[PDB]
């Protein structure tokens, strides 16, 4: 089902991220409810710097946020931003792969080519052709 795969391709990528962050100097074999708790706090954290750094830049009449809008956004969440250059240069740092794409073939349809009929003058040429 590609309908719930719109959400589950990115939430089950955040589950691999928390599973990769709880292994770095830490756990193996965590409880199941403790992983869906922590990946819910992770999605709610990315969605909160999304809403608040957009609010801080648009308060200053801008549309896309700079660095000075996020270092005030993270201050208003209590982050202590200066410890982040040391966290980025870990030797335990890992990369979680992005999710796969549903349309792997992209163009696999031979199609059915049938043309008959024209257009009456109240239908312009850019509308689809009348069928067979």
């Amino acid at each position: 089902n590609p309908a719930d795969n719109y959400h589950l391709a990115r939430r089950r990528t955040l589950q691999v991220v928390v599973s990769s962050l709880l292994t770095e100097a830490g756990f193996e074999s965590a409880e199941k409810a403790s992983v869906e708790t922590l990946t819910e706090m992770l999605q709610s954290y990315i969605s909160e710097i999304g809403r608040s750094a957009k609010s801080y830049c648009e308060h200053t009449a801008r549309t896309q946020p700079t660095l000075s809008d996020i270092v005030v956004t993270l201050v208003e969440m209590g982050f202590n931003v200066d410890t982040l250059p040391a966290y980025a240069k870990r030797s335990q740092r890992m990369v979680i792969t992005a999710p796969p794409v549903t349309n792997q073939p992209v163009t696999p349809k031979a199609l059915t080519a049938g043309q008959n009929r024209p257009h009456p003058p109240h239908i312009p040429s850019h509308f689809p052709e009348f069928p067979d």
Binding site: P2, A3, E58, T63, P121, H122, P124, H126
Partner: protein, 487 residues
């Protein structure tokens, strides 16, 4: 609560939760119901039996509740049949007075028409030479326009949104069928070009400074070819975009959303220009004026605001509804704003003085679609009861009722001539109604004894493949466009 009407069932379950005082002190809908007066239009033949049972001191307390909490609006008529009373009731403060529906309404079109308002009544904007160039190619489309009627039924071109796994919440098409906007639940507006002409942004300010002016082609030399797509995504709402409205000059997209802002997107730079923050609550609809300067936005805060794209604050606040203003539609002369709502009333508002000049009651569910006749004399409204009620504007009697649809009628439009009203609902059907045989007949009593003309007024039903018809549009050559988001 058991001996109530069946169409009050969603109203009583909000009351079953209300048992405490402090539960009701923060509801703000039952707080305004307790202070207002139910209007309760009754006849004088039945009011004499009521007042002969209440003026006596044997009862003497239910009469005290009636004259404290209920208005009673009396009118002189032959008594209506049960299926005529059923057609014009269903709203809280229902069946409003005839003294509200007797004000003079300038329901005519601008340019003699005695029902037309003067051009300097509402200060409408000038007609520029590029806007006068639009009407020159508009009447070339009117040359190929077919007369639809009950015989030459129009062709419907459904523009389905195929994937749409972010939920499509708003569609608009330009007046010439050239752009289609989509408001989605992932807080995006997406403009699609439907003509074979890609969406281009204008060049940056460094590129415009080197080119000249008054070259009599500068409307093509400024368009950037480096940016040319069949789809432009617009970001900036922090919530699902519920309204979408193009401007008649094909710039200036409008969008409203759950976050309480109305946004004015340019279609020459494809950025956001203004964010209109007057509601703190979800703005359920917005629409530009048909002349393109003013726009009206209705929200969850039970008002509809009139804006002007020049002020950060509104000009008119239309604040008489008792529930959410679901729809907001301008009149074709843009002197009047129709606001359907969730308290089952449709109200016309004069742009001068902000006064409610008409109150149209008779829907059983929240009104989810309004449209005006191109004459300006009629108004079609649809709601969740599947009923399309056709109202007069100079009289205010809703002379017709179309009851073919099953679920919520979410889109209505008349033809370009006015020959056919097209209705689209959540039944996945596009029904066509004869909008000439519906108004053929068109007071002192407030009703016309409307018939069951629904079967005669049907021309077709056109079931759609699992796709709710969100928008209905009429091409200027009288071709129906519809957009759905296939589920």
């Amino acid at each position: 609560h058991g001996d109530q009407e069946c169409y009050y069932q969603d109203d009583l379950r909000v009351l079953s939760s209300l048992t405490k005082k402090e539960h009701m002190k923060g509801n703000e809908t039952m707080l305004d119901f307790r202070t207002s007066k139910f209007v309760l239009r009754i006849s004088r033949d039945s009011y004499q039996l009521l007042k002969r049972h209440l003026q006596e001191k044997q009862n003497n307390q239910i009469w005290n509740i009636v004259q404290e909490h209920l208005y009673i609006d009396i009118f002189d008529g032959m008594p209506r049949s049960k299926q005529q009373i059923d057609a014009m009731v269903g709203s809280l403060a229902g069946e409003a007075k005839r003294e509200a529906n007797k004000s003079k309404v300038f329901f005519g079109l601008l340019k003699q028409d005695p029902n037309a308002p003067p051009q300097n009544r509402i200060p409408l904007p000038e007609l520029k030479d590029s806007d006068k160039l639009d009407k020159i190619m508009n009447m070339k489309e009117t040359t190929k326009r077919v007369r639809l009627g009950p015989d030459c039924l129009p062709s419907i071109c459904f523009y389905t949104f195929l994937n749409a796994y972010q939920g499509l919440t708003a569609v608009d098409v330009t007046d010439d069928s050239s752009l289609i906007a989509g408001g989605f639940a992932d807080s995006t507006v997406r403009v699609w070009s439907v003509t074979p002409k890609k969406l281009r942004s204008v060049k940056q300010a460094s590129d415009l400074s080197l080119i000249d002016k008054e070259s009599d082609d500068v409307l093509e030399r400024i368009m950037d070819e480096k940016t040319a797509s069949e789809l432009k995504i617009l970001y900036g709402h922090s919530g699902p975009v519920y309204g979408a409205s193009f401007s008649p000059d094909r710039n200036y997209l409008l969008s409203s959303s759950e976050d309480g802002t109305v946004r004015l997107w340019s279609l020459q730079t494809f950025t956001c220009l203004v964010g209109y923050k007057g509601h703190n609550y979800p703005v359920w609809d917005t629409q530009f004026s048909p002349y393109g300067y003013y726009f009206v936005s209705g929200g969850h805060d039970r008002v509809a605001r009139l804006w002007a794209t020049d002020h950060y604050q509104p000009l008119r606040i239309f604040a008489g509804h008792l529930a959410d203003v679901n729809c907001t539609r301008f009149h074709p002369n843009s002197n009047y704003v129709a606001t359907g709502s969730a308290d089952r009333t449709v109200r016309l508002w004069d742009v001068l003085n902000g006064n409610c000049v008409r109150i149209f009651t008779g829907h059983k569910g929240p009104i989810h679609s309004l449209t005006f006749s191109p004459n300006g004399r009629f108004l079609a409204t649809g709601a969740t009861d599947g009923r399309v009620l056709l109202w007069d504007i100079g009289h205010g009697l809703m002379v017709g009722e179309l009851k073919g649809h099953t679920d919520t009628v979410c889109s209505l439009r008349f033809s370009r001539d006015g020959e056919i009203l097209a209705s689209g609902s959540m039944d996945n059907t596009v029904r066509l109604w004869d909008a000439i045989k519906a108004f053929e007949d068109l007071t002192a009593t407030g009703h016309i004894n409307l018939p069951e003309n629904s079967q005669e007024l049907l021309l077709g039903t056109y079931m759609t493949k699992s796709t709710p018809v969100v928008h209905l549009h009429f091409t200027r050559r009288n071709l129906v466009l519809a957009a759905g988001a296939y589920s």
